Amino acid sequence: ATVNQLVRKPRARKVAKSNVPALEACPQKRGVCTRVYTTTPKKPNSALRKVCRVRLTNGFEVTSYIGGEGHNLQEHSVILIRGGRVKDLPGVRYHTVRGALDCSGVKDRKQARSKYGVKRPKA
Amino acid sequence: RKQVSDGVAHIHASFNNTIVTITDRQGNALGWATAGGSGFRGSRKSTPFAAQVAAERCADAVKEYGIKNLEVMVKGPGPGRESTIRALNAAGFRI
Amino acid sequence: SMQDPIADMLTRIRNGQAANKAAVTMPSSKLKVAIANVLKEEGFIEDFKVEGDTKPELELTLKYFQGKAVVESIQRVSRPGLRIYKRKDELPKVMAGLGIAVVSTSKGVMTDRAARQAGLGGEIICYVA
Amino acid sequence: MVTIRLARHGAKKRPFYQVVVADSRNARNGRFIERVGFFNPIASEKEEGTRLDLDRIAHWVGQGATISDRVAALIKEVNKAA
Amino acid sequence: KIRTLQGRVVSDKMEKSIVVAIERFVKHPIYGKFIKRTTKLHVHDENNECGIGDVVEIRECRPLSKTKSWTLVRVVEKAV
Amino acid sequence: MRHYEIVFMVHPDQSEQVPGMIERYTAAITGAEGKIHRLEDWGRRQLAYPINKLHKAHYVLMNVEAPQEVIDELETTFRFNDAVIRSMVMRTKHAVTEAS
Amino acid sequence: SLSTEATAKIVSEFGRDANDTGSTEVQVALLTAQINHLQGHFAEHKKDHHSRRGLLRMVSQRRKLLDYLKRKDVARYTRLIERLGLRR
Amino acid sequence: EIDYKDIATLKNYITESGKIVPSRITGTRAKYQRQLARAIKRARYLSLLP
Amino acid sequence: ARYLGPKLKLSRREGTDLFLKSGVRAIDTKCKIEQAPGQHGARKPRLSDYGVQLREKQKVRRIYGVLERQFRNYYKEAARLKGNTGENLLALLEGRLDNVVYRMGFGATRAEARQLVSHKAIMVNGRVVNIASYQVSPNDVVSIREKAKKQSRVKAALELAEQREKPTWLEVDAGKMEGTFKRKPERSDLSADINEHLIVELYSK
Amino acid sequence: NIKSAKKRAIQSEKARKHNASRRSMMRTFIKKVYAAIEAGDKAAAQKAFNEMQPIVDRQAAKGLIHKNKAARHKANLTAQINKLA
RNA sequence: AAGAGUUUGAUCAUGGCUCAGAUUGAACGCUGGCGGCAGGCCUAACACAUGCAAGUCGAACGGUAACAGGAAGAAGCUUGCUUCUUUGCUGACGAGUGGCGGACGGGUGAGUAAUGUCUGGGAAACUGCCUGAUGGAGGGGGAUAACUACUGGAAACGGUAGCUAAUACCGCAUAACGUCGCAAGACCAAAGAGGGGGACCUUCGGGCCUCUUGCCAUCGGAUGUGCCCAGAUGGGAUUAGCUAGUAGGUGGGGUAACGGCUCACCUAGGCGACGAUCCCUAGCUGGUCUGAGAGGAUGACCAGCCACACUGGAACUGAGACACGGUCCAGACUCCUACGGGAGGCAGCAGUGGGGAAUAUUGCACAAUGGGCGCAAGCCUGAUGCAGCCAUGCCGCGUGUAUGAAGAAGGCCUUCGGGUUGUAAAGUACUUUCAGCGGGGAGGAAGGGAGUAAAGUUAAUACCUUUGCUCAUUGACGUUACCCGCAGAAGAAGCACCGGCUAACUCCGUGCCAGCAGCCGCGGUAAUACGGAGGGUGCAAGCGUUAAUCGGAAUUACUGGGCGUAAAGCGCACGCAGGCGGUUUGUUAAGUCAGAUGUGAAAUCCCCGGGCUCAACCUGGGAACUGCAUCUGAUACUGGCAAGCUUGAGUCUCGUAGAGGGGGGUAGAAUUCCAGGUGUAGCGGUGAAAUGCGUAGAGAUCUGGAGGAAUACCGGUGGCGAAGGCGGCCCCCUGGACGAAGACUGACGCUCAGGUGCGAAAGCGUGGGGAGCAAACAGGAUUAGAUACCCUGGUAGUCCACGCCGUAAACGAUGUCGACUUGGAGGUUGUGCCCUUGAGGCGUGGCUUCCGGAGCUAACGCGUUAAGUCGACCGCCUGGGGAGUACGGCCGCAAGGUUAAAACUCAAAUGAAUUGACGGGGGCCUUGUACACCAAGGUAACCGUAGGGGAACCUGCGGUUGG
């Protein structure tokens, strides 16, 4: 940290690490959803959790959390995925967009009803 | 063998077993005796009883030689150094 | 001392102050004289005096307020390694002007308000407070 | 060729013109040598609609500088206003 | 006498030309240290009157060759 | 050229040749440009440990001043002579002449 | 190691006057002589390493003195390095 | 002052077998002690003492 | 966007009264009060330092019928204006045309006044201005359009205007209905308990 | 393809043939001077210069070559001649 | 101007992670009224259907295909009503020639890491149109397209023959103020057209007069472009050498111009650690975002510059191009074909396919402002003005107002009384913004046209120019803004959230499931955390979620960081360049500083105004642009230069100690065997035997030989050495250290990347050597099995000579050097004074040990031998793992070493200390890792290296307290 030391090789900036690295600065990415399975969370929790395996248009194959109290996906359906990790076994760093491409809003939902792609009941 | 009533008792006081020779002033052995094999063997050796009984064995091995004064030239430290010296000298010998 | 004889003097001052030495001493040089003059004429220290010719020394006399040093923090700024020069309109106001910054201007070593009055900048020798 | 033309600034349907000394060949409101006044076609009555600063226009005209017709008519109007 | 940089001869080994290091003492933009920065600069002298170490005045002129646009004015100190 | 203290034991077996071996080395020293500052003998003393199968030794110490080199041949001869099994010499670090 | 008489004599020849054992030329002269003696006695050991450290010290100090001579006064240096024979 | 040849004032500083008594009980200024050990080892090699 | 909901409840949360059901029946007679407007209003209201900054600021927003984008815009203006941010903000809130129409009397509540302003019944300096947030400036004459002077509500909103203490910084005329914003008001004659530095702390981070 | 581009293309080629003819004739005269010089013949070279000069000087006048160019030929050839003198 | 949560029983730390803020060219979910103003392919410089984006000029020209007039004729014969023919006769004009334009405007950001950009300078240049000055503007010719007649080719595109004009071309004349030349001299140009017409001539065409405009030359201006220089403008040293028109020279040539630009010759340079070359990324700037600021990130829109136009070459023409909608040729594509041959290039506008999370109309008008051409009228203009689409952003406004309770039904909660939703509704009265309908209605329009005097000018009147006034006229937007009227509250509210942070909570349901989650975490019978309800909170035409940037984060620390134990001080030295430099003078003026001047586009930002009903927006003026340059001045400081001074550093002299290093032999302690006797039943060992020895004489004894390991005691908190490390004695050689002073030099210093050298033990390689060892290896038994442990032998190695290794817990886990700063005790050595006893007493040096004050510290601790206070330089660190590993380089006999990633992966890892629990080391007191909320324990924790072995384990030689 001598000034003559700094002049010879300046202070470098470390680089922001990989947090959602499968998305190249894109809000969402489309994917093809190869397999749909149901994993199991870490230790303190329970209640085996629905997760899908998806191949993104940019080449990546990643693991994405189908959330909501209801689910209809399949083995090739095309879905949109966005950032957001689950405190699950390592590597669920993406969240499937509920109700956007081949994906539907949860059934009978009536609160937080845009966070699952379900439309306003006409009342 | 010589009936000179003099000599030295080289106490080969090793840790496990002592083989004390009885040699005169000239430097020739009179009689030899040992602790181990002469009545007991085991790891329970290296005890003052073993050194003592070795001392009596070495004494009686040369009590027939007319020797009643044996100096002690101990080689190395051995268990029951006090015990072996006492048992050897109490047989009627002079250091 | 060896390469910066001026931080020598600041360090001797704050050493002898924190250890409650009556009067600090060092060898003398006309720029050391200059900062001593500045300090005592504006009064952060009491008095100084130089003795001998071949190896002069500087018998500077510290200044205690109650038992505390009058000089709270005295800092080197333009060390060999970063010579610091300021222009007059960017001269540094030290602790809301309460402490001086003895600058070296083209018109001799002199203090901060001195320069901003005379309207010229220069090299900052040492903040005092 | 150097010309004294107008550069349309302002917002939409509320034009404001800068009178500008420029090379004939640059975009209407692109690179320009000098600004000599402004024109507000939709100015209010108390509001100043034209300012020209005609010494510079005379200067540049003396160096061989064409005027657009709008700046020409505008200059005639300011001269009439006196 | 336009601006006449002032520097040292570091090689007269080409015919009628010298390399002249102009040594300038500029602060560091971010660390504020004053660093030595050097400008090597081919100069023309037709008389080959400069030798390694001289201190010369040089002035800018039209391009005399590739790489060569400065010309010798005076030899202010004839280093030996 | 500085003081040494030639110290050596002459055995009774080798006491046959005390003057010959001694005066020979004094002459060799003087011819090697060395002057003798002292001379004394401690007689035939006794050896605590019977080194070299003997108990007596006529300890003669000659203690001449010698330069760096003229000692090398003398100690070589001492090693090569059975008159003294082991001969010792000492540097001075000072100016000491008297024997005791 | 070097004889004191030799130091005094080199002071006489390679000193401007007497008792100027501090003169730069005197310093480099005695130091170079010590380096020469070390080089002469080097063939015998070579195995020795802790003695070599002082010899490198002597070499470097001699060169520093010579560099100071060259910097301060070219003529003194460019005469000494021959009448002493150094800087070969 | 203390040297090797003074055999008289050496018996006080040794034992029968020639074992150096430590200065922890005598007091020898720790410079005379090195000279003491030097001289007595010399005497061992001088074969006056074991 | 204008808040269009129950008016009494909006002021039950703020604790004090806000002059937004304004008239005769003297609320706490017109509708229960001193109670937070829920099924769980009886709860202890102990609320953090953030809760009270938010409550006071929110009550200032509810006094004037201003939403959060314009409110923070008023704050950015007061913070850029010269003087303490608190009074600059509250003066901005006070020179707003809906407020001043209310204050001059004609306009029974601030939403009554907002209704009149928006419905092209107010001239500012003799020309019609129907913007609610129109900042009225000193010496401007605010007047009812004469096509709308014979409004039953404006005539009624004028009797119940002296029970409200007459504002000092402006001189309404009642017979001919017209006023004159004499001067920007001062913290003292903004007759309330507005703890404005709670607001200037909410937005100071 | 635009109509004026089609016309520029036919006009360019006509002008190119015209220009090529004029430049080749000029280079012929200049080369005659240069080749009288290398023969070392002073008077032949001066006459060839007097035959080249109006040619390059009118080519420059009608814009086939720049006036600076014509001046350069005249200066260089005058040098060569006056050296050869 | 420097939040919250997040490693523990708890804590103080070190340290990463996650959310809070602002922002966006955003996207997606749910929802969606109006207006204003902006923005709108960030990805595929991917491929491109179709239309449009560059023409104009008849006042240059031959013309005359058209249309329209004529003027006729011939007719029909209406009195000539309309039909044919003729006539470029006239308006005009299609194709052609000619001029100007097409080099602008418009797009894009591929390439480009620096001659590109930015800042500031320069000199060797050219510049159409515009402008000022001066002059000229004579007299001829030959073509040729068109056209005419043929005539190929499918088409593209042609060929032949004749014909012809010009402001096309070409002579000739003329000819400086131009070029060339020292001068003398030589040389060098051009074009007409239009309007009007008195008089006069007239070959009746015109001449001729006059005006207008053009043409040519030169010299200025202005503008634009070219060229040069300096500084600044990414990353990588797992790129260190690169260059041969390369560097300079002299001459030819070339260029508008300088110049290796080029060529011939000559010379051998030139660039590079101040980073050349090479590789990667990349358009630059004004500015934008963010920030307290420094700074970081950016470079969409707007404006400046650059580059590109399918890809790669080349030029032509031109004032300008190496040319987006030009040429050529070479590709690759697509299209056309009669298979001969052709065509084309949306990085114009729109649009398509594609790709993408994702980004609009194949609109209207040239009314305005620009631009091109034209005398003008005009024509052209996807520039531009507008309109469309899209909550994409910003702004504004609305979706009502007041009243009213029987505080309704009814919903939800009900401790069953009721409460709450809630003045909310309804019912009352009132309003009618905006939306809708009808009527009106600015402003963006200046102009241009037609008519009206100056003797403007001059054949005076004409023509034209200018002002002269009058008349008519020009708006895409646009059924504009805005105003007026008319109904009717009528047409207009959603999204998130409600355990704490964090504003806002109850009931059912569910039951560690379903699920939620930024963090803490919630859920196994309530669960205010999950789903629904009711209630509330927040924001509102939006509200959420995602992504990305900056901040928080001072978490790359210049401002503004650390390296004893948390990551981090090289194993140790010497030292090159480099960074830094005691003191006093002289001088310089480099840095520095001051002043002046020039500059720093505009926009943007900021201040003060003004205009839009307001606001956004637009705008005027200022400030700002903190920079760069130049000039003048100062001299304190740093630098240079010159001279000194002695305190720094050194030389000398004299002494002092020491396992300091190298040499050689050096004797004994002990060492086994042999040499023999003396002696016969044992030598031998573990958990236990056993394996192995011996009775063939074993063990021990003395006698003598060997050889080598180490020189026990000394010995030490000792000493020495730069570190590793150093222990017999003697001598030789030698280093370093210190004390005493003196004499002298005279800043000759400190630190150092790269570099060089030294460097435990193991090892390796080379040969010896082997008294014993002792990894390996070989006998017994193991133990749950034994390749445990273990007892028996035993090689390599250990030893020596040489060489290679290059390592360590190489540890004070504390870089070097200098300076200052309360103490105490101890040892270690010198040396002065005075007891002139030897110490003594009082010092004074250096070294070292243990406390301890302030001070510092996370705490422990350090504490004049700093971990305090400072200065100089270096090395090093940035959460954990991956991993000191791969790869590359380099080194080595290999063994390996050295430099040193990345992918991937976690939300932690880690240090200090504390409460006490096991405490099988002691007399209510002693304690530990770990632990809790197992450092005395089937056999310390490691590091280096080498073996055995599936392995982690064990075992050798060395070392550490991290016991």
Numbering used by the authors:
A (entry chain L): 1 to 123
B (entry chain K): 12 to 106
C (entry chain H): 1 to 129
D (entry chain P): 1 to 82
E (entry chain Q): 3 to 82
F (entry chain F): 1 to 100
G (entry chain O): 1 to 88
H (entry chain R): 19 to 68
Paper text:
RbfA has been identified as a bacterial cold shock response protein required for the efficient processing of the 16S rRNA 5′ end during the assembly of the 30S ribosomal subunit. Here, we report cryo-EM structures of 30S assembly intermediates accumulated in an rbfA null Escherichia coli strain. Cryo-EM analysis of ΔrbfA 30S particles revealing the accumulation of two predominant classes of early and late intermediates allowed us to suggest that RbfA participates in two stages of 30S subunit assembly and is more deeply involved in the maturation process than previously thought.
The structure of immature ΔrbfA 30S subunits belonging to the second most common class D (30%) was resolved at a 2.7 Å resolution. However, in this case, the entire rRNA density was present in the body and the platform. Local resolution analysis showed that in the particles of class D, the body is the most defined region, whereas the platform is less well resolved. The densities for the proteins S11 in the platform and S5 in the body were fragmented and the densities for S21 in the platform and S1 were completely missing. These results indicate that in this intermediate, some parts of the body and the platform are still not completely formed while helices 1 and 2 have already acquired mature conformation. The second type of ΔrbfA 30S intermediate with missing density for the head belongs to the second most populated class D (30%) and represents the particles consisting of the platform and the body with well-resolved PK and helices 3 and 27, and missing h44 and h45.
